[PDB]
Amino acid sequence: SVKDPTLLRIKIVPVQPFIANSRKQLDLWASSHLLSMLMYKALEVIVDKFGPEHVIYPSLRDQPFFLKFYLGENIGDEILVANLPNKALAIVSGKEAEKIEEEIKKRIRDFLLQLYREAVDWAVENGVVKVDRSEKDSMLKEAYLKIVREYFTVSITWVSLAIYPLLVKILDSLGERKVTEEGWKCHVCGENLAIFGDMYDHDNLKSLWLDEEPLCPMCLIKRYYPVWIRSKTGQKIRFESVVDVALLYKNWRKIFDEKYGKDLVSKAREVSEDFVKDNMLVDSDLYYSSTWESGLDEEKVKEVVDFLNAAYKEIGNPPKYYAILVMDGDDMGTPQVHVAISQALANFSIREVRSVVKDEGLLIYAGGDDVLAILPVDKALEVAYKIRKEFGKSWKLSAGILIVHYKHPLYDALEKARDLLNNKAKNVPGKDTLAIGLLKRSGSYYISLVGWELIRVFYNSELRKKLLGKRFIYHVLREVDTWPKVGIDEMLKFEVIRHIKEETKELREKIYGEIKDLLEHVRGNNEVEKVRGLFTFLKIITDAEVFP
Numbered sequence: 001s002v003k004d005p006t007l008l009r010i011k012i013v014p015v016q017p018f019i020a021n022s023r024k025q026l027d028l029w030a031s032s033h034l035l036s037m038l039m040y041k042a043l044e045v046i047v048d049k050f051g052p053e054h055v056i057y058p059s060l061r062d063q064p065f066f067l068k069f070y071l072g073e074n075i076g077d078e079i080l081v082a083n084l085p086n087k088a089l090a091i092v093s094g095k096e097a098e099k100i101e102e103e104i105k106k107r108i109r110d111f112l113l114q115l116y117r118e119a120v121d122w123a124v125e126n127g128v129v130k131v132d133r134s135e136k137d138s139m140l141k142e143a144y145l146k147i148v149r150e151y152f153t154v155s156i157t158w159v160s161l162a163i164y165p166l167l168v169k170i171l172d173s174l175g176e177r178k179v180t181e182e183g184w185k186c187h188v189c190g191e192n193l194a195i196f197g198d199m200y201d202h203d204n205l206k207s208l209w210l211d212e213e214p215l216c217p218m219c220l221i222k223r224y225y226p227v228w229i230r231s232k233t234g235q236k237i238r239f240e241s242v243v244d245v246a247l248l249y250k251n252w253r254k255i256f257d258e259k260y261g262k263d264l265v266s267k268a269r270e271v272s273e274d275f276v277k278d279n280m281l282v283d284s285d286l287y288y289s290s291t292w293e294s295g296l297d298e299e300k301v302k303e304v305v306d307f308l309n310a311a312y313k314e315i316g317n318p319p320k321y322y323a324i325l326v327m328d329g330d331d332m333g334t335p336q337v338h339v340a341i342s343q344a345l346a347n348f349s350i351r352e353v354r355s356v357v358k359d360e361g362l363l364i365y366a367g368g369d370d371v372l373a374i375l376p377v378d379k380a381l382e383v384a385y386k387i388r389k390e391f392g393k394s395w396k397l398s399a400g401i402l403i404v405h406y407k408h409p410l411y412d413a414l415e416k417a418r419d420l421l422n423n424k425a426k427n428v429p430g431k432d433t434l435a436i437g438l439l440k441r442s443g444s445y446y447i448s449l450v451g452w453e454l455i456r457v458f459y460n461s462e463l464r465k466k467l468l469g470k471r472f473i474y475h476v477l478r479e480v481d482t483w484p485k486v487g488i489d490e491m492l493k494f495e496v497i498r499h500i501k502e503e504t505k506e507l508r509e510k511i512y513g514e515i516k517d518l519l520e521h522v523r524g525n526n527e528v529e530k531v532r533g534l535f536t537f538l539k540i541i542t543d544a545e546v547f548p
């Protein structure tokens with residue numbers, strides 16, 4: 001702790017607008033990973049000037065960005081998760097403080113500009129932007145340069161110096177103030193000028209861009225970033241599309257490939273060479289008959305539809321839904337103790353979340369108290385529960401899980417999932433809540449707010465064991481659309497009795513009991529709403545279109 005000790009805070013924004021409008025999983029991953037990369041660029045300045053132990057939060061001890069890009073360790077696929085938060089604080093000597101602010105702003109600025117230059121070279125060379133090698137240099141003109149340059153605001157503030165917590169709660173003040181100090185649009189985000197959008201007409205713009213959807217510098221950077229990463233590391237995310245996550249359901253793709261796979265790729269090539277690339281389907285949505293029927297020789301297409309249906313009949317229907325899991329710690333909250341809680345969170349987000357998600361879906365971000373993952377629907381509930389338990393062992397957590405159809409617009413899905421977390425789970429008194437929602441392709445939306453222990457109770461329950469029945473759920477739910485005049489207890493006893501050898505006597509007794517127990521852990525201020533919660537939950541996890 002030397003010398004002229006100063007406490008310094010860094011915040012990088014925007015986060016949610018940047019990550020928010022992402023039209024594809026790969027973009028979403030790239031937004032998240034790039035943001036964390038920016039924080040790496042920031043903290044590296046402090047490590048260079050002082051040392052790793054000078055960063056109080058986040059704790060750098062296990063950080064894969066530092067192990068790889070700093071020390072050169074070979075860490076493999078772990079590098080694909082973003083673990084670095086957009087806020088940090090460190091201890092620096094007061095004389096260094098301003099020097100450090102400048103150096104950081106600059107390093108982020110220059111990093112982004114370099115990515116952008118590399119990005120246009122890549123774009124022109126790979127034909128994502130169809131333009132001569134002459135006019136590539138118009139893409140580098142001062143305007144777009146200034147867009148890249150000013151896109152992220154990096155706020156830095158420092159207080160001088162056991163009353164530690166006091167001033168610790170101060171810098172978010174000047175740091176709260178600093179964030180507030182300040183042609184044709186892009187077709188992806190919509191929020192920035194498109195590259196050629198100023199010097200050209202619309203048709204003159206849309207035409208020359210790949211898929212007639214021009215990008216601003218920011219989204220061009222997003223598009224290049226996974227290639228940047230696959231060159232700097234040898235790594236690329238295992239599942240590029242949400243369909244690829246969706247099909248992890250019940251190992252459906254593994255078993256399908258193993259049995260019917262080669263035959264399918266051949267049937268598809270037999271239709272057209274353009275559906276098959278490297279003895280694989282060009283699109284994972286091609287595992288769906290529905291896509292062969294609609295979206296785009298019709299006899300050999302019928303042959304693929306027939307083939308698929310047959311295979312479904314043997315192996316089961318194809319999964320069309322996936323889950324977005326969003327988690328955040330509730331009300332989260334002495335310098336050595338600050339380091340202790342920081343290291344606790346770091347171990348959680350780097351080690352433990354990873355160890356529960358693993359290969360079973362895509363972990364995009366673990367930022368200490370925050371998590372973002374895309375999961376197959378049959379892993380969503382247990383991944384959320386297990387991560388919750390892990391966090392408790394380090395303390396409480398709310399989550400939202402949006403189950404959505406593969407064709408639903410990603411930015412809207414993320415908006416909704418994040419809404420589930422913030423406007424529902426977080427608005428329950430005491431919080432510590434899971435908000436589950438299911439947005440059916442038809443457009444009907446089902447939400448249920450439960451407590452974490454509803455998952456364990458339901459897990460162990462005979463009721464669950466039996467549920468794998470339907471008419472039951474439908475009837476109890478039909479009863480609570482408004483409410484039974486006969487009251488809840490009576491309606492429930494009636495309904496249980498109505499759907500169960502004579503061992504029924506005990507079964508009915510235990511179930512009714514279990515339900516009562518389960519009802520305890522559903523959120524809501526009265527029993528009818530608690531039954532609605534419980535039974536909507538049940539309707540969701542048993543839905544045959546969603547869980548086929």
Ligand SMILES: Nc1ncnc2c1ncn2[C@@H]1O[C@H](COP(=O)(O)OP(=O)(O)O)[C@@H](O)[C@H]1O
Binds near residue numbers: 328
């Ligand atoms: N690299 C990243 N990838 C994905 N999400 C991120 C990243 N960095 C920050 N975030 C998200 O941005 C949010 C900003 O958090 P914050 O401003 O503290 O709001 P709150 O007070 O609700 O926590 C966090 O919830 C975090 O999940």
Ligand SMILES: [Ca+2]
Binds near residue numbers: 328330332
């Ligand atoms: Ca929080």
Ligand SMILES: [Ca+2]
Binds near residue numbers: 328370
């Ligand atoms: Ca948070």
Ligand SMILES: [Zn+2]
Binds near residue numbers: 189190191218
């Ligand atoms: Zn854009």
